[PDB]
Amino acid sequence: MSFNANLDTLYRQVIMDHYKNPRNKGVLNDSIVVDMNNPTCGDRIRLTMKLDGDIVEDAKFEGEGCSISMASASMMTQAIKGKDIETALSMSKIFSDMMQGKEYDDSIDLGDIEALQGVSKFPARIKCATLSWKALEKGVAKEEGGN
Ligand SMILES: [Zn+2]
């Protein structure tokens, strides 16, 4: 293949959207503080959220590293910042469920999901993919517990 918008144009939009809103790397000490490093690649994402009730009030992502990691976290935490715990647990319940079923999203909203899965498989990109993946699922947990 010469040109394919499979991942290139996808993360292109992911980082460009992140540039239209130039905010990244922050720390909110309140309720949940979960950071995830990739000491091989240099990525470091400190996910500091504030869930004040049964929702998500805010989230600060101190994400450093490469193009995908700091961007994906910012994108998924933006959706989380505007969600609840039920909706977050559901999003991750289906997020993991996709891997058992085949390929499907209840909302069809696979913008980051298809980007994160793209790098998920390359030996060098898998640890940056699992980085954002495991860090987000670890923040508020997933499904109804995960464990
Ligand atoms: Zn990295």
Instruction: Tell how far the Cα of 100 is from the centroid of ligand 1, in angstroms.
Output: 27
Q: Nearest Cα to 48, choosing from 38, 63, 37, 69?
A: 63
Domain ranges of the chain: 1-147
Q: Check the annotation: does 128 bind a ligand.
A: yes
What is each CA distance from 115 to 4, 50, 88, 109, 126, in whole angstroms?
A: 13, 26, 19, 12, 12
What is each CA distance from 72 to 31, 80, 96, 101, 144, in whole angstroms?
A: 22, 12, 17, 23, 23
Q: Check the annotation: does 41 bind a ligand.
A: yes
Distance, CA of 120 to CA of 52 (rounded, Å): 32
Q: How many residues does the chain have?
A: 147
Backbone angles phi, psi at 15, to 5 degrees: -80, -30
Is the separation of the CB atoms in 52 and 13 below 8 Å?
A: no
Q: CA end-to-end span of the chain, whole Å?
A: 41
Q: Check the annotation: does 43 bind a ligand.
A: yes
Long-range contacts from 80-84, C-beta under 8 angstroms, 24+ separation = 80/49, 80/56, 80/136, 80/139, 80/140, 81/49, 81/56, 81/57, 82/56, 83/55, 83/56, 84/54, 84/55, 84/56
Instruction: Tell how far the Cα of 41 is from the centroid of ligand 1, in angstroms.
Output: 4
Q: Is 106 helix (H, G, I), strand (E, B) or coil?
A: coil
Distance, CA of 81 to CA of 59 (rounded, Å): 6
Residue 37 tokens read as: 């490093």
- Residue ranges of alpha helices (H) inside the chain are 8-20, 67-80, 85-101, 113-119, 126-139
Q: Nearest Cα to 64, choosing from 33, 43, 47?
A: 43
- For the domain bounded by 1-147, which CATH number is listed? 3.90.1010.10
Is the separation of the CB atoms in 47 and 74 below 8 Å?
A: no
Distance, CA of 146 to CA of 140 (rounded, Å): 10
Is the separation of the CB atoms in 47 and 34 below 8 Å?
A: yes
Q: Looking at this protein, which amino acid is placed at residue 7?
A: L
Instruction: Tell how far the Cα of 43 is from the centroid of ligand 1, in angstroms.
Output: 4
CA angle centred on 18, ends 79 and 143, rounded to 5° = 25
Residue 139 tokens read as: 């923040």
Q: Solved how?
A: NMR
